[PDB]
Amino acid sequence: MHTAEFLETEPTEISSVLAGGYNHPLLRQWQSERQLTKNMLIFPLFISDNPDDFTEIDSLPNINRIGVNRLKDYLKPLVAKGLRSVILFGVPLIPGTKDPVGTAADDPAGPVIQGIKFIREYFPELYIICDVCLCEYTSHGHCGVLYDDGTINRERSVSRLAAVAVNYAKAGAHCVAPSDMIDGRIRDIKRGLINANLAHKTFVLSYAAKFSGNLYGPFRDAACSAPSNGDRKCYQLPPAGRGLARRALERDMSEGADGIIVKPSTFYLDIMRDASEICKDLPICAYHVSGEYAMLHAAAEKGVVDLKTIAFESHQGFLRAGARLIITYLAPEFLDWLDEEN
Amino acid sequence: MHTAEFLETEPTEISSVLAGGYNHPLLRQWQSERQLTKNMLIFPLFISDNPDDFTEIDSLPNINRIGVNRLKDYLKPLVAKGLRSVILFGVPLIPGTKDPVGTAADDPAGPVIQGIKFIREYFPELYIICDVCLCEYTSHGHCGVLYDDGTINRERSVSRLAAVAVNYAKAGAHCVAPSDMIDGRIRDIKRGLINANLAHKTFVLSYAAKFSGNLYGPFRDAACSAPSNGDRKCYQLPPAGRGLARRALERDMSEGADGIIVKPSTFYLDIMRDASEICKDLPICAYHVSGEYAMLHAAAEKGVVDLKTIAFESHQGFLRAGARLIITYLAPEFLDWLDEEN
Amino acid sequence: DDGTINRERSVSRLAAVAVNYAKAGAHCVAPSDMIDGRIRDIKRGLINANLAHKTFVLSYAAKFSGNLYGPFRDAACSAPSNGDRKCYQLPPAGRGLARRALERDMSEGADGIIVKPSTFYLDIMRDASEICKDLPICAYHVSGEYA
Amino acid sequence: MHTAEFLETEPTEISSVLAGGYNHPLLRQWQSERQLTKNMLIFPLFISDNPDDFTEIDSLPNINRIGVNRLKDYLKPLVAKGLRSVILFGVPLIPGTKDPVGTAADDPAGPVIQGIKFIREYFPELYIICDVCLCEYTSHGHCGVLYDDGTINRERSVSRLAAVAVNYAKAGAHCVAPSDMIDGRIRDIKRGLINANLAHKTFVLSYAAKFSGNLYGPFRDAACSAPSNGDRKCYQLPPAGRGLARRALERDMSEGADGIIVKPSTFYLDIMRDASEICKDLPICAYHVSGEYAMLHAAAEKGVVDLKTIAFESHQGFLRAGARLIITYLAPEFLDWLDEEN
Numbered sequence A, B, D: 001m002h003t004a005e006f007l008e009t010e011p012t013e014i015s016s017v018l019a020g021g022y023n024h025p026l027l028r029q030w031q032s033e034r035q036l037t038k039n040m041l042i043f044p045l046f047i048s049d050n051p052d053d054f055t056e057i058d059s060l061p062n063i064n065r066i067g068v069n070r071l072k073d074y075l076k077p078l079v080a081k082g083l084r085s086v087i088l089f090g091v092p093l094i095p096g097t098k099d100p101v102g103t104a105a106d107d108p109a110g111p112v113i114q115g116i117k118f119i120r121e122y123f124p125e126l127y128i129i130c131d132v133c134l135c136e137y138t139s140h141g142h143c144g145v146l147y148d149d150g151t152i153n154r155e156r157s158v159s160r161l162a163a164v165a166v167n168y169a170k171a172g173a174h175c176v177a178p179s180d181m182i183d184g185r186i187r188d189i190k191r192g193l194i195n196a197n198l199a200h201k202t203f204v205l206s207y208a209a210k211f212s213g214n215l216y217g218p219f220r221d222a223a224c225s226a227p228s229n230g231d232r233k234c235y236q237l238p239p240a241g242r243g244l245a246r247r248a249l250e251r252d253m254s255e256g257a258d259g260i261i262v263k264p265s266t267f268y269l270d271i272m273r274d275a276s277e278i279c280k281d282l283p284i285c286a287y288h289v290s291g292e293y294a295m296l297h298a299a300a301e302k303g304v305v306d307l308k309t310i311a312f313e314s315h316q317g318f319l320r321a322g323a324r325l326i327i328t329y330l331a332p333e334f335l336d337w338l339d340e341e342n
Numbered sequence C: 001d002d003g004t005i006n007r008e009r010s011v012s013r014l015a016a017v018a019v020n021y022a023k024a025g026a027h028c029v030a031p032s033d034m035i036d037g038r039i040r041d042i043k044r045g046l047i048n049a050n051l052a053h054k055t056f057v058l059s060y061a062a063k064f065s066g067n068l069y070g071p072f073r074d075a076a077c078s079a080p081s082n083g084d085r086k087c088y089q090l091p092p093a094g095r096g097l098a099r100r101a102l103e104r105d106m107s108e109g110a111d112g113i114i115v116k117p118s119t120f121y122l123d124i125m126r127d128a129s130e131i132c133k134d135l136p137i138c139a140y141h142v143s144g145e146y147a
């Protein structure tokens, strides 16, 4: 008869026993480097020039184009549940608005600056963050000033970027986050802020490690800046580019960045890890891109994973990889989930 | 008129310019720490006791229950395309087979050992890896010998595990990978192998960092060992448990592991990063669990990302995080994709 | 009878009490004695009692002798005097010993370490944060600091 | 009967035995990284414009407002007991003295510069240190030149600070310690000193890590610069700001600081620890702020701790955390305590 065999073993080595540290539910919390709090979430917003807008993108519940006139009733509840911050994305829909130099970027009458004045008044405790780029304002759609050759003209673009950034700060935005990727833009924005005597009031949250890939789908649909699928990648770091990513982090920090953002998040967890050592003194933020979040919804839909569970696992993943800040479309949800206790 | 402003900037610092290294397609390859080769893929197999089986699980194309009699025609093409290895998972379906001590685990007539003899003969170049656990053979389903109290009895289970492992090695398997998680099992298996005078022929590929979570869904459906949803987590590391994960890696390596596996993969990229430093001298393998792969398919289905693209991005992610080996259900595909060139 | 502490006897005694608490239902045991090697003996006892996988060993790895345990002594009734008979209590300037005690306890099975006092020993939690970088670190705001 | 149980134990491991190193009183001294000497203490002084002043603040024995005419009889004994240094704090009480630009800061006839000339003559061996700030001279009270907006104007303030610092040096002060916190002030003061051809004679003791908090109470009462309670915190580092503190240390050292000060002390011991690695080549000084010392007195009063004991424990704490210098109001006492021996 085939019988159950058992090998001859020695006494248990203490050094093999780790189970004493994670056998209780509360211990599973004790074991985490950092716990998830509501004041760690940054909710993204897509302001439309149509002050009466409210368009849902790709069926994703936390991705809408809202006009200033709907902003109150939408932000009201959120702030009530504990939302402490948001990152503004302008979507100028009015015809003949976009152009070669993204002039509308700092248009005092655009969705961004108008959104700032609104928030700064209807919600003075909220911390306003503004994404800085020319992609949603240039006729071509790229994140900068290109030559007739097509390529990006560093100097011109960067000089343009510093202008928009400083203008947002002047408008009342507490923080600026350039997602362009053009070399040296962080230094030029820091300088501009310095000369504008705003460097001591504006947090520079640089998109230090933004990789090109197959996960920005939804976002492109909503921000309208349509790069195709994945060919025209400006300063977007190749996915395998760990070396460049590490160098970009040391660069941006050296150029004035007060905090860095890694994105995508989930698919780049080892990168936040590297950042956690390089930028060990700076707040690290993870960006759960529109594609990752749209991916969680899909799988959940097909019942491949529970939505609420995979969100916690994924988000805690950010915290574990080294991040202490999180920009995510799941913010509305977490503002609820984080409460369920007591 | 709102005009496009441009700030006063200084001459470009060389140290800001990184674009010179990733502006060409071939350079994007030059920038990667390691390139993806076909001999890096480990295709998982689920052997059934019904020698004539061939059941597709959850609609996932690369997750099937195959009997020995279908194994040839299935492995034929794969090996032709370059498959160099597979990790065996036994699924005994015959009634009254499973029991309290997972006796059938090393059953010379079971799917695993029978699968080994088959492969070792019909495909002598293939490298055989066998997952070592009691979960798919115990009446209860857990990965070990539990007390009447329910809990796992370390000593008994581990002594049992070393037995099965050594028996697989004796059967002809080149490598054993214990996915249990019970403390000290690696040392007991190494010893058993040593005493069985097989330690110099069997690669011990330990599941050093296996986290409990919401991503093993599909696999449970196919391996039939049904832990519920996510409550009875044996030695499964809490997702936030980076400290424990780091300690488990140092432990397993110290206990004889010749290589380590991190799993899940994508959601634990920072962990392969940590492993890449801790186990800097050992091959690191990433396991693209059934749930992550089922997640890529879902999102692709809803057209959230291109399947072939997100697979390359995700898999290259493993290589970038430090891994040099990959166990994935996408192996059939990659064996094709990796070819398209010349 | 000499007054001094008998390591072997005491430690053997300590492992007994610890394991008994675990057997009673306590999830975690924290030995605040300071006697060398007690962590290993308690870990073993727990192992033999087949409780090592359910009991978190929260060792008082860095407990310094000093002028801050006043209140606590009044309440726990165990009255060492003022500050003379300090058993395995680390001298306040003893950073080296504190660092060694941390590596020892962790190596002996501790699942987490406690530093105490807290405030007056913040640089020590700092050292611990590197030494025991993989273990939960706990600070003890002693009765004297709070008072 | 409940009997005393004793577990079965193995032979003692040498590696568990540390007691051989601290079982004797002299060994407790042998174990310290550095011993406490009298020439390590810096006694603070608050000079008043009333040359005949002598006011005790908040009942704290070593916190008095003294005029030049009382300075001798007060410093006489102290220097006799071994005092080798003091840090000057000016308290101009004369009406209409303070203003918007802290003009009186380097007033050749003010308490500070007058105090320097006095000391330099009546006690030539004493090492004079001068705190550099505008807080005790500006009409508003803040440590710098503010805009009508209220905020601090970096450029103006810093340019002002370098002026005062260099003037103190010109007056005869051996060392300058800017406690402002304004970014870049260290570099501007170093430069000024360089241009004043005094950089090779003046030790720049920067307040690199000065945290805002609830411990400067007493001091505010005596220096008269009354920021409220704890709201208007200029460049004061948030208590949780370890990252910023680490960056500020690397900055000040890079800007010319010859030594750094950490403050508060006790409540920031881990910070001196960080400093001990960052500024491993520079003397590190701890500042036992007025609030910590007032706290020791209180607890001692209520008989919670012995004054003389907790002072030694706390102060040795500074030395252990990495400090080799100590600014404390307990200096008179220690100059006595350090003697009791032989």
Ligand SMILES: *C(CCC(=O)O)CC(C)=O
Pocket (backbone or CB within 6 Å): A131, A133, A179, A207, A210, A215, A216, A217, A218, A219, A220, A263, A287, A288, A289, A290, A291
């Ligand atoms: C990044 C986030 C895109 C997404 O959510 O899909 C926007 C940016 C780089 O500014």
Ligand SMILES: *C(CCC(=O)O)CC(C)=O
Pocket (backbone or CB within 6 Å): B131, B133, B179, B207, B210, B215, B216, B217, B218, B219, B220, B263, B287, B288, B289, B290, B291
């Ligand atoms: C791990 C892989 C599970 C999956 O593919 O979903 C199996 C194991 C831990 O043995």
Ligand SMILES: *C(CCC(=O)O)CC(C)=O
Pocket (backbone or CB within 6 Å): C032, C060, C063, C068, C069, C070, C071, C072, C073, C116, C140, C141, C142, C143, C144
């Ligand atoms: C430590 C705490 C004493 C106090 O709170 O004052 C007690 C112990 C060492 O067990």
Ligand SMILES: *C(CCC(=O)O)CC(C)=O
Pocket (backbone or CB within 6 Å): D131, D133, D179, D207, D210, D215, D216, D217, D218, D219, D220, D263, D287, D288, D289, D290, D291
């Ligand atoms: C710091 C010391 C304050 C105190 O003793 O309470 C004075 C300064 C920052 O110049």
Ligand SMILES: [Zn+2]
Pocket (backbone or CB within 6 Å): A133, A134, A135, A136, A142, A143, A144, A179, A180
């Ligand atoms: Zn852009």
Ligand SMILES: [Zn+2]
Pocket (backbone or CB within 6 Å): B133, B134, B135, B136, B142, B143, B144, B179, B180
């Ligand atoms: Zn198992």
Ligand SMILES: [Zn+2]
Pocket (backbone or CB within 6 Å): D133, D134, D135, D136, D142, D143, D144, D179, D180
């Ligand atoms: Zn000041």
